[PDB]
Structure 1
Amino acid sequence: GEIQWMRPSKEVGYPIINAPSKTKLEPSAFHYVFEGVKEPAVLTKNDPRLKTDFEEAIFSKYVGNKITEVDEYMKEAVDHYAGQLMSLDINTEQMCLEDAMYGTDGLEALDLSTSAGYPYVAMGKKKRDILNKQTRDTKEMQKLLDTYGINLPLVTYVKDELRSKTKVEQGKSRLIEASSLNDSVAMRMAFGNLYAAFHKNPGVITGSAVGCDPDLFWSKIPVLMEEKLFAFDYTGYDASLSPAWFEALKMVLEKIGFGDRVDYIDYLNHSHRLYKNKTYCVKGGMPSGCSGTSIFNSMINNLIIRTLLLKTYKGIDLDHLKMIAYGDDVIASYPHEVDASLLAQSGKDYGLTMTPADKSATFETVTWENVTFLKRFFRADEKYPFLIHPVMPMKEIHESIRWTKDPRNTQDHVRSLCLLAWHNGEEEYNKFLAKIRSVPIGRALDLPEYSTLYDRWLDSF
């Protein structure tokens, strides 16, 4: 990904975009009861905590485009992976406007909270106005698609979330690039069926984990995986993707019966976007807040791994590659051991920064005892070994609970955390509930006891 040019929006007929200058995150009732070193991300150029220019910091994720064309290795990766998706019988038909808008089996209805995008964000028009759950009306949207068309600029927002002390001081705040409602709708109509297929089939056939339920999915993973596991982390995956990877993605889509609408991928790839008073054009790099982003990143990750395997290890049998990706996150396996370090260097050739899995200083053997996926460890149940617990470290949970966006969401926010926490064992969980109940707010909450969660989990398979 690389910025081609940037400049004042007024010079090209675009209006300035107001972005919430204040963070919605504030110390929660549990701020001093649990330990955390995280603070709200930097949102404006003026934040006193900065130690380097804010504008440069946020855009520096656009490293450039290391590759131009789609080489032989990528092509075979495309063939192999396209070959697998082919077996799912993915409905190639387009999805109707109604389903694309209000959900259907396999696809949730448009999220009514996230940005409406341009020009709606500049008109003052919000989502709850364009649609509604009960009546499932499309007349309004239909009228708006005809009015402002598609392929509209993305609106770039600084993501309001928790970041480490360093990330704050270096202004390393992440960006959400909001897709226009129209684009969102169109893309959903175009690939709705593809998304549904993916959500209903997390595993080694889609090579995707998007939409999965970790409580249940964990127990299936090891079975699906080959003998020797391998993994690594990416640095700025989304922004590092070169146009060539999008081309490969288009090739896959084309091979699975989506040829007629690969144009949407160009839009993700080579787009035009708005940030405050500035307008800029980007070549390469996957925009975060667009329709299919997770799925497309995952598909690309499938092509990436294959490509590196093919280039690093001629003769490799991809039919024996068992991987599951969730965007840039990935768990992979092969019957034979592979050198992650060696793969990381082949990666650098395709504009990919690959480092040891889970910030280890050096590349080491990945085992079931140390591997993580979606920040979660894998731990067989002490009583029912065949059932695997997804284990989110308590540190993450403590960090999260120390803050709040909406005091009314406290109940759900804590409840959610518990559903994650209990997998750390009864003793750990009780200490957690104990701490929660050491403040009035926490005592007022309605939380599940350990035995409840455990029994429900056991019964769920």
Structure 2
Amino acid sequence: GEIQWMRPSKEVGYPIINAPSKTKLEPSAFHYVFEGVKEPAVLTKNDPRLKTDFEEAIFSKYVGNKITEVDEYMKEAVDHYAGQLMSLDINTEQMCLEDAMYGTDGLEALDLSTSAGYPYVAMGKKKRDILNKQTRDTKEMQKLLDTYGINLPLVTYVKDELRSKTKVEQGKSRLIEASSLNDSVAMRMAFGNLYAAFHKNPGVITGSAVGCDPDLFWSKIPVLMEEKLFAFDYTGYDASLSPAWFEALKMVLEKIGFGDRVDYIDYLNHSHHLYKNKTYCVKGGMPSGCSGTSIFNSMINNLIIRTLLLKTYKGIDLDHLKMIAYGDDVIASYPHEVDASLLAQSGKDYGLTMTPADKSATFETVTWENVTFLKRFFRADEKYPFLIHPVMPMKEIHESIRWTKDPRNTQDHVRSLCLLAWHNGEEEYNKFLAKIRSVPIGRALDLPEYSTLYDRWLDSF
């Protein structure tokens, strides 16, 4: 990914976008009962915590575009993956505006909380209006489409969330590139069934984990994997993607019945952005808040791992490559061991920064004991080993519980954390419940006891 030009949104007829200069995160009722070292991310250039230029920092994610063309390896990777997806017998038809808007089996309805994007964001109108759950009114969107059309600029916000002190001092705040409701609806219409198919099929055939339910899914993973596991995480995956990776993505879509509308992928690739008062153009880079980002990122990652394997191990059998990705995150396996460090090297040649899975110092052998996927570990239940526990470290939960945006969501926020936490064991869960209940706020919450959770889990399979 690389920014081509950036300039004043007025110099080209665009309204200045407003971004709340103050975080919505404040210490929670449990801020002192639990340990944590993360704070809200820098939202403005002035933030006192800054030890470098904010503007330069937030855009440095665009490290450039390393590759230029789609080579032989990529082309083969494309073929092989497109081959697997072919076996899913995906419905290539377009999705009727209604479904694209209010959902249908395999695709949830549009999220009402997130931005409506340009022009609506500097024009006032929200999603609350245009949509209507029980009505299912295509008419308003329908009207708004013909009026403003598609392929509309992306409104870029700074994401309000917790970040390490380092990433606070270096302005490493993550950005949210929001797509207009129009684009989002169009793409959902174009790719609606693709999304459905993926959501309904997490695993090694889609090589996607998007839509998955960790509580159930973690038990199916080990079975799907090969003997030898390998994994690594990327640094700035989204922003590092070069145009060629999008082209390869279109080749896959094309090969499975969507050559029809691969044009959309073009706007994800070469895109128009609005940040504050400035406007810019980016060549490459996957926009973080578009409809499909998550999934297309996983598809591309399926192309990347294959490519690096064909390039590094001529003669490798992709048919025995068993991997599952969730965006930049990935868990993979092969009948034979492979050199992650070496694959990481080929990665640089393709514009990808790959590093030892989970900030490890160096690349170590990946095992079922140390492997993580979505920050979660894999732990077979003591009483029924054939059931695997997705295990989120407590540190993560602790960090999350020490803050809050809306006091009205404290019940749901803690409840949610409880559903992640209990997998760390009964003893751990109770210590956790104990502290939550060591202050008025906690004592008033409706939290589930271990036994209730563990039994419910057991019956869910």
TM-score using structure 2 length: 1.00
Deviation of 1:53 after TM superposition, in Å, equals 0.5
CA distance in 2: counterparts of 1:441 and 1:427, whole angstroms = 22
Listed as ranges, the matches of 1:144-183 within 5 Å are 144-183=144-183
**DSSP-derived class of the 2:330 partner:** strand
Instruction: Give a deviation string over 1:337-372, Cα, whole Å, max 9, x none.
Output: 000000001000000001101001010000000000
> Hey, what's the Cα distance between the residues in 1 that align with 2:208 and 2:8?
40
Q: Report the counterpart of residue 452 of structure 1 in structure 2.
A: 452
1:269-312: per-residue Cα shift (whole Å, max 9, x none)? 00111000000000000000000000000000000000000000
- Superposed displacement of residue 331, structure 1: 0.2
Residue deviations 1:96-121 (CA, integer Å, cap 9, x gap)? 00000000000000000000000000
Looking at structure 1, the residues matched to 248 and 137 of structure 2 have their Cα atoms a distance apart, in angstroms, of 37
Q: What's the counterpart of residue 69 of structure 1?
A: 69
Question: 1:391: Cα distance to partner?
Answer: 0.2
Work out the CA distance in 2 between the residues paired with 1:131 and 1:220: 37
Once the 2 structures are TM-superposed, how far is the Cα of residue 256 of structure 1 from its aligned partner?
0.4
Q: Distance in 1 between matches of 2:455 and 2:63?
A: 49
Instruction: Mark the runs of 5 or more structure 2 residues left unpaired by the alignment.
Output: none
Cα deviation per residue 1:11-50 (whole Å; 9 max; x = unaligned)? 0111100011110111000000000000000000010100
Alpha-carbon distance between aligned partners in 2 of 1:459 and 1:232, rounded to the nearest angstrom: 33
Output the CA distance in 2 between the equivalents of 1:411 and 1:307: 46
Corresponding residue SS for 2:11: helix
CA distance in 2, matches of 1:409, 1:117: 25
Measured against aligned partners, the alpha-carbon deviations of 1:389-442 in whole angstroms (never above 9, x if no partner) come to 000000000000000111010000000000000000000000000000000000
Secondary structure of the residue that 1:106 maps to in structure 2?
A: coil
Secondary structure (helix, strand or coil) at the match of 1:11 reads: coil
Deviation string, structure 1 residues 249-285 (Cα, Å, up to 9, x no partner): 0000000000010000000000111000000000000
Which position in structure 2 is the counterpart of 1:360? 360
**2:15 & 2:445 partners in 1: Cα distance?**
45
RMSD, aligned CA? 0.4
Render the CA deviation track for 1:211-230: whole Å, top value 9, x for unaligned.
Answer: 00000000000000000000
Deviation digits for residues 74-127 of structure 1, max 9, x if unmatched? 000000000000000100000000000000000000000000000000111111
- Tell me the residue number matched to 1:5: 5
SS at match of 1:352: coil
In percent, how many aligned pairs have the same letter?
100
Residue by residue, what CA displacement relative to the aligned partner does 1:164-203 show, whole Å, maximum 9, x if unpaired?
0000000000000000000000000000000000000000
Give matches, 1:273-288, under 5 Å: 273-288=273-288
Alpha-carbon distance in structure 2 between the residues aligned to 1:401 and 1:120: 34
Match of 1:53 in 2: 53
Post-superposition offset of 1:447: 0.4
| Cα displacement (A) at 1:65 | 0.1
Match of 2:259 in 1: 259
Q: Tell me the secondary structure at the aligned position of residue 358 of structure 1.
A: coil
Give the Cα–Cα distance (whole angstroms) in 2 for the partners of residues 230 and 321 of structure 1. Answer: 11
Structure 1's consecutive aligned runs of 4 or more residues displaced over 4 angstroms after TM superposition are: none
Cα separation, 2, equivalents of 1:101 and 1:326: 24
* Equivalence for 2:331: 331
| Distance in 2 between residues matched to 1:111 and 1:22, nearest whole Å | 24
The 5-angstrom pairing of residues 378-457 of structure 1 reads: 378-457=378-457
Tell me, in whole angstroms, the C-alpha distance in 1 between the residues paired with 2:104 and 2:403: 34
What is the deviation of 1:233?
1.1
User: For 1:85 and 1:423, how far apart are their aligned partners in 2?
Assistant: 33
- Distance of 1:413 and 1:136 partners within structure 2: 30
Following TM superposition, by how much is the alpha carbon of 1:159 offset from its aligned partner in structure 2, in angstroms? Answer: 0.3
**What whole-Å deviation, never above 9, does each CA across 1:132-167 have from its counterpart, x for those lacking one?**
111111100000000011001000000000000000
Q: Deviations over 1:324-344 (max 9, x none)?
A: 000000000000000000000
Q: 1-side partners of 2:371 and 2:273: how far apart? A: 37
- Secondary structure at 2:325 match in 1: strand
Alpha-carbon distance in structure 2 between the residues aligned to 1:277 and 1:418: 41
After superposition, residues 5-404 of structure 1 pair within 5 angstroms as 5-404=5-404
Q: Using the alignment, how far apart are the partners of 2:186 and 2:155 within structure 1?
A: 17
SS in 2 for 1:308: helix
CA distance in 2, matches of 1:425, 1:123: 50
Alpha-carbon offset, residue 374 of structure 1? 0.5
